[PDB]
């Protein structure tokens, strides 16, 4: 049984990607992007699962390679770190790819990254907190959406959209946008189903995610996907802690009262 | 531990030149290398030739002795004895002696041997296949033909009886 | 019986040339360079795997004994010294044939070794580590490839590939090029149950490329076929010192520790 | 007793070595990656160890010689030169084993040196201050490393770290690593004792680990064993100068002020 529980614990502490219709519309949207080369910028709050949709279109395009020729990777994800030069960017590019740099001028790693791009075949651009590089850069991505015709979607908080308006062509060019909703409404209530049924994994106890419950999730989460994660695996993990097989209200509260 | 080298025991009538290039081949020195090492000079590189203008002395062959450990008369032993006259060019070899052990014998090198006394063949002065005089025996890397790539061994059914 | 785990260890610690996919490409890439006589460049990253398929495919065309002339080698495998002049890539390219020269000059050692590859009638130069080479010995390979009509497959890392994009003469000729497979996806699945007894050769675990073993395996490795080589080869080692039967979890822990 | 000082000088005055538990990790892992065959690299902090155990390392393993044949050194222990070139290395491990030649060319001694370490039956190359040579240097410890199936050790502080990881194929090599601790704890109540019974073997004074000497001797040494090696043979040092039978807690203060 302890070591039952340290494998529920180890579960619990990982995250998982269940879809539903927030990544459903994101990425139906984004194949739809891809089919015509049409750079966006989709938007969204904090902590409301942009990046996890982005992640699993990544990944459903798992790249097929061939016996003796590049891989055909036809969608680029990448994270830029704070104040990311364009070195570093192009660096991260032909790194994803996995093509190992070598040492030279700004000059040397764009033609190397225009290189690997061209070879791959790559089809999205997909660039995570898009708020963090330097606007040095974003004449660099223009250029590699414009002469390499690869839409580019621009990710990240509505700070981004503020860094990008101050600019000239980059708002221009990059326009259409997919923001991301609230959730709130019966949606709420079958996305809280659902992750009792999936992700908690815990055995049924009949909680039916009663009207007591789903009050206290609302006034919790305000709506966040990420903050109802958040919750719901602490609640289940120190109810896990002190014997208790399922969640009862009494870690809710304090879990809650805990956060506000 | 002492210092040492990567040894080669000398063959029986063996040559100079041969037990020299197999010396250096073995230790991946020079000739000139292996004269500096020695503290002769140059002079190694012109017994890989043959040309005993100043017939090799026994300083110039003690002094070897400390360096590639054979004894300096099991080094005079693969000279020709003193009054024997050898002719420098060109390098002579019987097919038969080499295959039974792969060196080059001194005595092919006398004046007066044109046969050889354990197989009764005249032995050869240049490939019986294409007609390339062999080089120094010092500079057998292997048992070929530089020119043709005929194994030494082999030219023993070619070389008459 | 510590004499059959000493011959067992020595054949593990033995680098053992195994057959994959990728290196049946390769020796069919290969063959089509040969019969077209077309230079290429096959790159890959470091513990790809490169330099073991290159020699198994140069040990499957091994030079025949010709009895009218000096015999012919159909491929030529040389891996240079790291800064070395043209003169040591001539003395290299002869001493791998049966021919040999010393004293003379350069001009006289690429004479010579002009005459000894148009003597063999060499189809293929497989250049092992090919940026070991300084760059006015490239203009010399150039040469030997024009000249007789040989084609020079210069094998080695994108540090390679940097080099050649560094001059154009260079790089003029050696328009094609073969990247290799990183084997992400489903084939190292392939890969580790094939390795798990066709290398190894000991009484499995039916570990099949379990889950925890595999996923074990990826967080070591990354697709790195030389990487799950000596790591599965060490492993065993330390299992069959220790008097274990098969290899177990601890050991694996342990393993990918000190190299992650 | 003037006599007997300059005496117990003369003892104090060598470096004995003391066992631990680092220098027997460091020996067992050693020898695993010996029996294994396989490249590594003990990163590690300054004057924590790597040489006193790596040194007593080849002395476990004492060199066999023949009157007339070459010996068999199973490990060759090195010190490179600050930008020690190929030659240099190639020298040191020329000299190490007791060749007998000295010159050459840069090749020609490659070539020694290589039939030297298949000739010896050398199997552990420990290349002690690994990060005072420069990366040709360490493709050609590649080369040996691939060609003579040798266990390469890389010893030096994390600057070696940083140095190999610039290269591609030298940071694949030597993916496994040891690190040296500073034994921050528990070690030192013991590693004190023992140092004051064997290497001091001075008139006990009845020590005993006492947390008055053992606070000072924390703050002073701070954890690396040479500054303890140093600061506790200069107190004794100190200690006979003024003819004290037992190191008084005012020598130790002394020696901790010249040092800090
Ligand atoms: N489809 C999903 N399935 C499960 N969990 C999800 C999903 N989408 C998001 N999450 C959860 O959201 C949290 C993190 O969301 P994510 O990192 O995707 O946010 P984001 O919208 O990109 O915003 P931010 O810029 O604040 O990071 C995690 O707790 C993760 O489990
Ligand atoms: N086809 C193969 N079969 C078995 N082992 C292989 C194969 N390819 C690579 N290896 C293993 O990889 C290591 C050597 O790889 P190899 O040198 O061929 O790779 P590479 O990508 O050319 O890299 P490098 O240029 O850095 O040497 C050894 O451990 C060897 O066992
Ligand atoms: N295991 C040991 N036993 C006894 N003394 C030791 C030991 N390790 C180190 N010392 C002491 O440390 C000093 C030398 O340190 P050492 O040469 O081991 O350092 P290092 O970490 O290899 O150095 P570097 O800073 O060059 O990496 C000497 O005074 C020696 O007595
Ligand atoms: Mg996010
Ligand atoms: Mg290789
Ligand atoms: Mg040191
Ligand atoms: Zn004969
Ligand atoms: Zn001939």
């Known amino acids: ?260 | 531990v002492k210092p040492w080298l990567f040894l080669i025991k000398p063959y029986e009538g063996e040559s100079l030149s041969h037990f020299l290039g197999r010396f250096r081949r073995a230790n991946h020195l020079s000739a000139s290398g292996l004269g500096t090492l020695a503290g002769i000079g140059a002079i190694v590189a012109r017994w890989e030739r043959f040309h005993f203008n100043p017939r090799p002395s026994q300083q110039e062959l003690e002094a070897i002795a400390s360096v590639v450990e054979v004894d300096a008369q099991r080094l005079a032993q693969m000279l020709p004895p003193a009054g024997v006259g050898m002719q420098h060019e060109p390098i002579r070899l019987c097919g038969a002696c080499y295959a039974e052990s792969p060196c080059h014998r001194i005595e092919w090198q006398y004046k007066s041997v044109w046969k050889c006394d354990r197989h009764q063949l005249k032995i050869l002065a240049k490939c019986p296949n294409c007609q390339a005089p062999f080089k120094m025996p010092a500079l057998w890397e292997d048992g070929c033909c530089h020119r043709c790539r005929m194994p030494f061994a082999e030219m023993a059914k070619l070389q008459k009886v």
Request: aromatic share 6%; with cysteine; proline share 3%.
């Open chain 1, 1 to 260: 049984d302890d070591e039952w529980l340290q494998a529920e614990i180890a579960r619990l502490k990982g995250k998982s990607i269940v879809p539903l219709q927030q990544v459903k519309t994101l990425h139906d949207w984004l194949d739809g992007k891809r089919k015509a080369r049409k750079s966006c910028r989709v938007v969204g709050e904090s902590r409301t699962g942009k990046t996890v949709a982005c992640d699993a279109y990544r990944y459903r395009h798992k790249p097929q390679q061939e016996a003796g020729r590049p891989p055909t990777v036809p969608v680029v994800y990448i994270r830029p770190h704070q104040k990311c030069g364009p070195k570093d960017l192009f660096k991260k590019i032909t790194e994803y790819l996995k093509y190992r740099v070598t040492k030279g001028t700004v000059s040397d790693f764009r033609d190397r990254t225009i290189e690997v791009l061209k070879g791959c075949g790559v089809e999205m651009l997909i660039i995570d907190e898009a708020d963090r590089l330097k606007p040095e850069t974003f004449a660099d991505v223009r250029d590699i959406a414009e002469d390499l015709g690869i839409a580019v979607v621009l990710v990240g908080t509505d700070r981004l959209d503020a860094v990008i308006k101050r600019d000239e062509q980059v708002l221009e060019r990059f326009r259409a946008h997919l923001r991301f909703g609230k959730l709130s409404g019966e949606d709420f209530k079958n996305t809280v189903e659902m992750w009792e049924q999936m992700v908690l994994k815990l055995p049924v106890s009949s909680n039916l995610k009663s009207k007591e419950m789903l009050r206290i999730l609302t006034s919790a989460t305000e709506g966040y996907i990420g903050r109802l994660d958040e919750i719901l695996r602490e609640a289940a993990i120190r109810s896990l802690s002190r014997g208790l097989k399922k969640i009862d209200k009494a870690v809710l509260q304090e879990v809650a009262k805990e956060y506000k």
